[PDB]
């Protein structure tokens, strides 16, 4: 019974690999010869936000490119204004450890999650004069590592118990469940069309789940180590991975295999968070040697290096306009690069 | 253009109030000390927090919280577990911890190997290399009653009990047989085997002995903490 299923799975994987080898006529490193180079991108820190006490773990840019959210391990969620460097709201959290924070596309809700296995949604209207807890949800057995807002009514959450969940803010119960992973689901990312989303875990693979049907479509298993961050391409047909393997990988939802690897022999530290720009030519990835490297998404060459942090950069965010990049590190610092 | 100036002054006043509240909370945050208790499921880690709570806030949701106050010192003890066995992904969060309370069980030598491996992996961690871990030897009365009744497995599972002596000279607890002292010191010397090769001057290991029921534990930690902040400060002014 066991051997007849194991050899069946083995020949299935061999057939899938033969298919990948059949559809692979060439690589992207052979067609990118007659392409103009970008050059040395010299970015400078314009503003410096100093309001965090403990280490900053994650952030999320807004849809208006005006306000951003940030979470630290002190127990507070800080909303920053990137223009005048002013804090408009400060919500004292009940727990001290938070691993993810998400800003709603409408600007009325904000979600936060951490080691308490509880996602706390706060409303930002503030009619009475102080912030209050709208509805907190607790239905996981692992740990909340990532959360994203699909709309003002639905939220996608990544748990550390091999289960991804889609919660509804009104009723507070799980609409669907995604059980396809075999390890702690690290992060997930939303497509601009909000129809399908890719999530990366510590299994050296990313899974492309659907929000309507409730199942996964493709599994890209070509990585080597625990994938940390996943970022869609601005078009919605491909994405990139960032992990501690010191190599950034690019996958596509239609190619179903690798596209191009970004590696270098003079670097040994891993990647913490990746984020594409508005165009997709430059890929910003925060490394583990206290810097953020911007790479060319078509040449696999170091386009630029920003060494402005003295601690490990924990989060990197690019707004929808691409005018500024916010890099938050473990030294309670948020650098605003141009 | 007057409305823009008015809203700007309003936002500036809001920023001033937010900074005032931030400083007010930073005061109590800097006046706060945290401690992280690590151990196995069968290890005697609940008997420490029970005696920390019965003599001197507490929440039971995922992680156990413990509060004990001795000599005007705050302590937030965190007993962390409700998750799966993989404790290597969320271990980067516990980076600013003052000291790691590591407790082990001496009643089971086969169950002590995984605790020794966890201690080795914690000492060899790149993020926990600047945090001194305090080693506690819990369940000593059971070890004493087990080694004397028989079942000699200390030299079978560990082939190092035939070539060993008693370097330290102190016998306050024993009054019947120094074999229990030899068995309690061999485990300490085995735990301090690889702990002195990785860390040279970054973090220190403090082995401490305790029983199943004790009352001077919260004190014993405090003195250890009293040293942990000292040497760190001694390393903050380039003096050693």
């Amino acid at each position, epitope marked *: 019974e066991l051997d007849q299923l*194991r050899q069946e799975a083995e020949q299935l994987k061999n057939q899938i690999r033969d298919a990948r080898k059949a559809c692979a006529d060439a690589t992207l490193s052979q067609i990118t010869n007659n392409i103009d180079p970008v050059g040395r991108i010299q970015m400078r820190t314009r503003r410096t936000l100093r309001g965090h006490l403990a280490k900053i773990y994650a952030m999320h840019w807004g849809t208006d490119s005006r306000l951003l959210v940030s979470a630290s391990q002190d127990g507070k969620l800080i909303i920053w204004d990137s223009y005048t460097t002013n804090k408009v709201h400060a919500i004292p959290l009940r727990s001290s450890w938070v691993m993810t924070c998400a800003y709603a596309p409408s600007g009325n809700y904000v979600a936060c999650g951490g080691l308490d296995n509880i996602c706390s949604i706060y409303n930002l209207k503030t009619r009475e004069g102080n912030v209050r807890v709208s509805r907190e949800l607790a239905g996981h057995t692992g740990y909340l590592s990532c959360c994203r807002f699909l709309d003002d009514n639905q939220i996608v959450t990544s748990s550390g118990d*091999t289960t991804c969940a889609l919660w509804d803010i009104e009723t507070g119960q799980q609409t669907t469940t995604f059980t396809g992973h*075999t*390890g702690d689901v690290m992060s997930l990312s939303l497509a601009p069309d909000t129809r399908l989303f890719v999530s990366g875990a*510590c*299994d*050296a693979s990313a899974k492309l789940w659907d929000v309507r049907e409730g199942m996964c479509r493709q599994t890209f*298993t*070509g990585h*080597e*180590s*625990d994938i940390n961050a996943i970022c869609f391409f601005p078009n919605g047909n491909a994405f990139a991975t960032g992990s*501690d393997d010191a190599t950034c990988r690019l996958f596509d939802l239609r190619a179903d295999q690798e596209l191009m690897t970004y590696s270098h022999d003079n670097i*040994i530290c891993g990647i913490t968070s990746v984020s594409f720009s508005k165009s997709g030519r430059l890929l910003l990835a925060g490394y583990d040697d206290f810097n953020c490297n911007v790479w060319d998404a078509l040449k696999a060459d170091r386009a630029g290096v920003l060494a402005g942090h003295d601690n490990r950069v924990s989060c990197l965010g690019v707004t929808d306009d691409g005018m500024a990049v916010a890099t938050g590190s473990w030294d309670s610092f948020l650098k605003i690069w141009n | 253009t007057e409305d823009q100036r008015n809203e700007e002054k309003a936002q500036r006043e809001a920023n001033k109030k937010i900074e005032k509240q931030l400083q007010k909370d930073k005061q109590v945050y800097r006046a706060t000390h945290r401690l992280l208790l690590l151990g196995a499921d069968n290890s005697g880690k609940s008997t420490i927090v029970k005696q920390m709570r019965i003599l001197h806030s507490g929440g039971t949701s995922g992680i156990f919280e413990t509060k004990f106050q001795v000599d005007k010192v705050n302590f937030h003890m965190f007993d962390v577990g409700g998750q*799966r*066995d*993989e*404790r*290597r992904k969320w271990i980067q969060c516990f980076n600013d911890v003052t000291a790691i309370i590591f407790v082990v069980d001496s009643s089971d030598y*086969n169950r002590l*190997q*995984e605790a020794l*491996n966890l201690f*080795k*992996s914690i000492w*060899n*961690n*790149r993020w926990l290399r600047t945090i001194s871990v305090i080693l506690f030897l819990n369940k000593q009365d059971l070890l004493a009653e087990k080694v004397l009744a028989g079942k000699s497995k200390i030299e079978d*599972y*560990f*082939p*190092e009990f035939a070539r060993y002596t008693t370097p330290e000279d102190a016998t306050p607890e024993p009054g019947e047989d120094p074999r229990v002292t030899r068995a309690k010191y061999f485990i300490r010397d085995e735990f301090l085997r690889i702990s002195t090769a990785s860390g040279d001057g970054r973090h220190y290991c403090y082995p401490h002995f305790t029983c199943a029921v004790d009352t001077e534990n919260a004190r014993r930690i405090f003195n250890d903490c009293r040293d942990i902040i000292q040497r760190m400060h001694l390393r903050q002014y380039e003096l050693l």
Partner: nanobody, 126 residues
Framework: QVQLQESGGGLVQPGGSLRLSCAASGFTFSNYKMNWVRQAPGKGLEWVSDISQSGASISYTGSVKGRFTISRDNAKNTLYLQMNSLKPEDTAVYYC?????????????????????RGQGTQVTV
């Protein structure tokens, strides 16, 4: 693709000699640490031994210290495990596990949960 294939074993009388092979493919062998775990019938997992990147820092479990030998080959990308002076109580299911972090000496691969960085296992009964 991270995959580990174990070969060797079978019904062997105690007191003889045995050799197990661990074939690794899809990743760099000379930069990752490996180890061995065993599952006893009715008992949990237990570590056996480990090996450094170059192969100098080798540490065994006190149950079998001088009876087990492990050797890595980066040119062939393989691991060899020689076992002599077998004991009848050493029967277990063997797992040739690999450490997820490179350029280090710490590994968390002793738990019996859903782990995806090891082989299918070899049944060695005596």
């Amino acid at each position: 693709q991270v995959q580990l294939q174990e070969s060797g074993g079978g019904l062997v009388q105690p007191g003889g000699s045995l050799r197990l092979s661990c074939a690794a493919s899809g990743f760099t062998f000379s930069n990752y640490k490996m180890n061995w775990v065993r599952q006893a019938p009715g008992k949990g997992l237990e570590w056996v031994s480990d090996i450094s990147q170059s192969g100098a820092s080798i540490s065994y479990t006190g149950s079998v210290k001088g009876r087990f030998t492990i050797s890595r080959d980066n040119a062939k990308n393989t691991l060899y495990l020689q076992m002599n002076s077998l004991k009848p109580e050493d029967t277990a299911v063997y797992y040739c596990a690999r450490c997820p972090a490179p350029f280090t000496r710490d590994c968390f691969d002793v738990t019996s949960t859903t782990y995806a960085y090891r082989g299918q296992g070899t049944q060695v009964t005596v």
